């Protein structure tokens, strides 16, 4: 929910480019890609950190039964 806000602002930042794509030409297109490439590092970061999972409080772990024989 917190990470929704940074990505929502990123989506809202593309609105100026939508209606000016022709005027900015290739210069604006390259800048638009650079805007998205810097934000794609955040996407890589969230994938590798697994930050978009569900924070359970219980964890099911399989204990091994062992015998301290004599």
């Amino acid at each position: 929910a917190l990470l929704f806000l940074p990505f929502d602002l990123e989506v809202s930042s593309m609105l100026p480019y939508i209606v000016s794509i022709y005027s900015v030409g290739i210069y604006g297109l390259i800048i638009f890609i650079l805007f998205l490439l810097i934000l794609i590092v955040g996407f890589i970061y969230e994938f590798n950190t697994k930050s978009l999972s569900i924070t359970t409080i219980l964890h099911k772990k399989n204990k091994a039964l062992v015998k301290n024989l004599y």
């Binding site: 399989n62 204990k63 091994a64 039964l65 062992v66 015998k67 301290n68 024989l69 004599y70």
Partner: protein, 126 residues
């Protein structure tokens, strides 16, 4: 002496029974458990017991199959008591049963006799 022995594994391939994983060292473990059982019998339970006599009869023959067979399927087919992972659990539980039986002294006289009317149902005594 620290004979740390794996009884149940918590990782590996599935055996076909949920929650029971493949034991990585089947044969060496069964030998160690079987032999420690026979020694534990001679040290805790008197020779007059019928439980001690019966356990040694099948512990040796189960041990005599693992000592003379390398194919896991052949060992299972000659005992007929589940997989070897299952056979290890059975051997572990039998070892723990000797400790309790020796503690209980189950071979002695009946501790608590029933009352006269106890096992009588509708007048016909059982």
């Amino acid at each position: 002496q620290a004979q740390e022995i794996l009884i149940k594994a918590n990782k590996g391939n599935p055996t076909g029974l949920t929650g029971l994983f493949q034991h990585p060292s089947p044969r060496p473990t069964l030998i160690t458990l079987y032999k420690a059982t026979l020694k534990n019998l001679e040290e805790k339970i008197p020779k007059e017991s019928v439980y001690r006599t019966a356990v040694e009869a099948f512990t040796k023959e189960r041990l005599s199959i693992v000592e003379n067979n390398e194919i896991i399927e052949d060992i299972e087919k000659k005992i007929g008591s589940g997989l070897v992972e299952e056979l290890i659990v059975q051997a572990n539980e039998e070892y723990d049963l000797i400790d309790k039986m020796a503690e209980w002294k189950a071979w002695e006289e009946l501790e608590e006799k029933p009352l006269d009317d106890q096992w009588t149902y509708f007048g016909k005594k059982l």
